[PDB]
Design a protein around this ligand. Structure first.
Ligand SMILES: O=C(c1ccc(Cl)cc1)c1c[nH]c2ncc(-c3cnn(C4CCNCC4)c3)cc12
Length: 259
């Protein structure tokens, strides 16, 4: 009823052809057509994408199925799992991510599902945020276990800074290939986030002092003492960032590895 009155009219096979099933998710099934097409909470997802238009957010085009811009570079997931990123490369991705979060938070929107799987890359090195299926001071236990802030896990009145935590977990993936406790169960991971809070790196000695600082400001247990997207954009670590072209050899490596 509300849904039909938002979505455009017509057969979703009248405007688009060459349907090649690229991915599969719990949310739906992602196809390519160049555009990308997927097939109460579904209403919230569409409206959020329409009103919050930033170059650091995957551009929403139309609905009937959802139609978006196609980012040929793939997901940050293949880069974090198949390649080794240098600190400059990690800083470049973090800066673009905080630029997406800054824009969302300022416009009073919490993402709640920040992870590498929701980071799409352009063939030019562009870093863009997607999946607003979970977006919303707040009190519902929503997200992906391994990326959830402890206050979300423990069922406390959480805010926009929960996205800063998951970004800190996403920095761990960039370093190690996986979020902390990925070997464990999603349920075991939940107990571990609540009981341990700040996760440890397997090899912190390998990181620089600024990168160790940026990580501790993303993963601070005290919400007030944890950084905001505005605060972290001016961080020392973000100054060592590389141009976004430094990410295109990473994209080339992930394509070759996942073939
Ligand atoms: O998924 C959505 C999306 C759809 C609907 C909604 Cl409401 C939100 C988001 C994409 C939107 N624009 C995209 N641009 C590129 C890709 C992409 C490139 N490569 N790949 C991979 C190929 C191998 N299998 C794993 C995925 C996926 C995916 C999307």
């Amino acid at each position: 009823e509300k849904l039909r009155s938002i979505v455009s009219v017509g057969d979703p096979k009248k405007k688009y052809t060459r349907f090649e099933k690229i991915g599969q998710g719990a949310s739906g099934t992602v196809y390519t057509a160049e555009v990308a097409i997927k097939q109460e909470l579904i209403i919230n997802e569409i409206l959020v994408m329409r009103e919050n238009k930033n170059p650091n957010i995957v551009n929403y085009l139309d609905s009937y199925w959802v139609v978006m811009e196609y980012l040929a570079g793939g997901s940050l997931t293949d880069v974090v799992t198949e390649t080794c990123m240098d600190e400059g490369q990690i800083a470049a991705v973090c800066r673009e991510c905080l630029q997406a979060l800054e824009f969302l938070h300022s416009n009073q929107v919490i993402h709640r599902n920040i992870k590498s799987d929701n980071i799409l890359l352009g063939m030019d090195g562009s870093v863009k945020l997607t999946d607003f299926g979970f977006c919303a001071k707040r009190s519902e236990m929503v997200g992906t276990p391994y990326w959830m802030a402890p206050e979300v896990v423990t069922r406390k009145a959480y805010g926009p800074k929960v996205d800063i935590w998951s970004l800190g977990i996403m920095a761990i993936e960039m370093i190690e290939g996986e979020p902390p406790y990925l070997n464990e169960n999603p349920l075991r991971a939940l107990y571990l986030i609540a009981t341990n809070g700040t996760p440890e790196l397997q090899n912190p000695e390998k990181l620089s002092a600024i990168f160790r600082d940026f990580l501790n400001r993303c993963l601070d247990m005290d919400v007030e003492k944890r950084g905001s997207a505005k605060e972290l954009l001016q961080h020392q670590f973000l100054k060592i960032a590389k141009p976004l072209s430094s990410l295109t050899p990473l994209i080339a490596a992930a394509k070759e590895a996942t073939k």
